[PDB]
Amino acid sequence: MVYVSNKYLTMSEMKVNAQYILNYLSSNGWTKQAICGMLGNMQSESTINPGLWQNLDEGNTSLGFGLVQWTPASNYINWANSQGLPYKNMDSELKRIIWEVNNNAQWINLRDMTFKEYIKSTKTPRELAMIFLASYERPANPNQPERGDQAEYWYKNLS
Ligand SMILES: CC(=O)N[C@@H]1[C@@H](O)[C@H](O[C@@H]2O[C@H](CO)[C@@H](O[C@@H]3O[C@H](CO)[C@@H](O)[C@H](O)[C@H]3NC(C)=O)[C@H](O)[C@H]2NC(C)=O)[C@@H](CO)O[C@H]1O
């Protein structure tokens, strides 16, 4: 059970999606800390909603889409379509992220941590949140310390 829509999720809805992501990525070798660091980012990017377009502007593939706001959305949608995966889909977006770690895509090593190091890390959810922000997401505004608060929130409130 996941929420997938072009709408901002409430805290209760985010919690359903966040637990799902943690279970999925744990089976693929990620630590809870690394997952929560990423979740703290996804909350700011999309309210952890695989269906969400930047500005709620549905169909604008030049802008952000999905959990992490792939920008341009075509960076992800092109891949899903080429891979025969439905683009508007939780698992499809998690598969992209796994694909990125395996092929060293998306990540720029600005904090002397590689993507492969990140996913195995037991640094705090706040620190990993800030690393994922700087290395993977890289939005026009880099000052979003709330992503670390959010990471810790998910670390505390999920299993
Ligand atoms: C208005 C705004 O902030 N929009 C946000 C997007 O900027 C942000 O997506 C990220 O955008 C940056 C800058 O375009 C991307 O980094 C660039 O990536 C290319 C590789 O294709 C590289 O050549 C550049 O060096 C690099 N620039 C910088 C400054 O790092 C980055 O890949 C985008 N991130 C993702 C996940 O696609 C998204 C996500 O934070 O949010 C929009 O709101």
CB 82 within 8 A of CB 95: no
58: its two tokens: 């549905």
Query: Side chain identity at 130, as an amino acid letter?
Result: M
Q: Whose CA is nearest to atom 5 of ligand 1?
A: 139
Active site (annotated) includes residue 58: no
CB 99 within 8 A of CB 105: yes
Beta-carbon count within 10 A of 82 CB: 8
CB 36 within 8 A of CB 126: no
Three-state SS at 53: strand
Report how far residue 139's alpha carbon sits from residue 151's, in angstroms, rounded to the nearest whole number: 17
Rounded to 5°, angle at Cα 71 from 36 and 43: 25
Rounded to 5°, angle at Cα 151 from 2 and 54: 55
For residue 69 and ligand 1, the question of a CB distance below 6 A is answered with yes
Report how far residue 43's alpha carbon sits from residue 47's, in angstroms, rounded to the nearest whole number: 4
**Domain holding 56: CATH number?**
1.10.530.10
| Number of domains the chain is built from | 1
Q: Which of 113, 108, 137, 133 is nearest to 123 (CA)?
A: 113
CA of 73 to the centre of ligand 1 (A): 11
Dihedral of alpha carbons 25, 31, 32, 37, sign: negative
Burial class (CB in 10 A: 0-12, 13-18, 19+), 65: buried
Atom of ligand 1 nearest to the CA of 71: 37
How was this structure determined? It was done by X-ray
Query: Domain range holding 98?
Result: 1-159
The Cα-based distances of 122 to 30, 50, 59, 93, 101 in angstroms read 10, 26, 38, 24, 17
CA of 64 to the centre of ligand 1 (A): 9
Query: Side chain identity at 154, as an amino acid letter?
Result: W
Report how far residue 148's alpha carbon sits from residue 62's, in angstroms, rounded to the nearest whole number: 28
The resolution, in Å, is 1.4
Burial class (CB in 10 A: 0-12, 13-18, 19+), 6: middle
CB 45 within 8 A of CB 137: yes
The Cα-based distances of 8 to 5, 36, 43, 102, 120 in angstroms read 8, 19, 10, 30, 30
Quote the distance between the C-alpha of residue 46 and its chain's center. 9
Report how far residue 68's alpha carbon sits from residue 44's, in angstroms, rounded to the nearest whole number: 9
For residue 90 and ligand 1, the question of a CB distance below 6 A is answered with no
Query: Side chain identity at 123, as an amino acid letter?
Result: K
Q: Whose CA is nearest to atom 11 of ligand 1?
A: 139
Q: Give the relative orientation of helices 146-157 and 11-26 as an angle to the nearest 10 degrees.
A: 70
| Strand-pair partners of 65 | 53, 70
Report how far residue 131's alpha carbon sits from residue 19's, in angstroms, rounded to the nearest whole number: 21
Query: Side chain identity at 117, as an amino acid letter?
Result: E
| Strand-pair partners of 53 | 65
CB 2 within 8 A of CB 90: yes
For residue 71 and ligand 1, the question of a CB distance below 6 A is answered with yes
CA of 141 to the centre of ligand 1 (A): 10
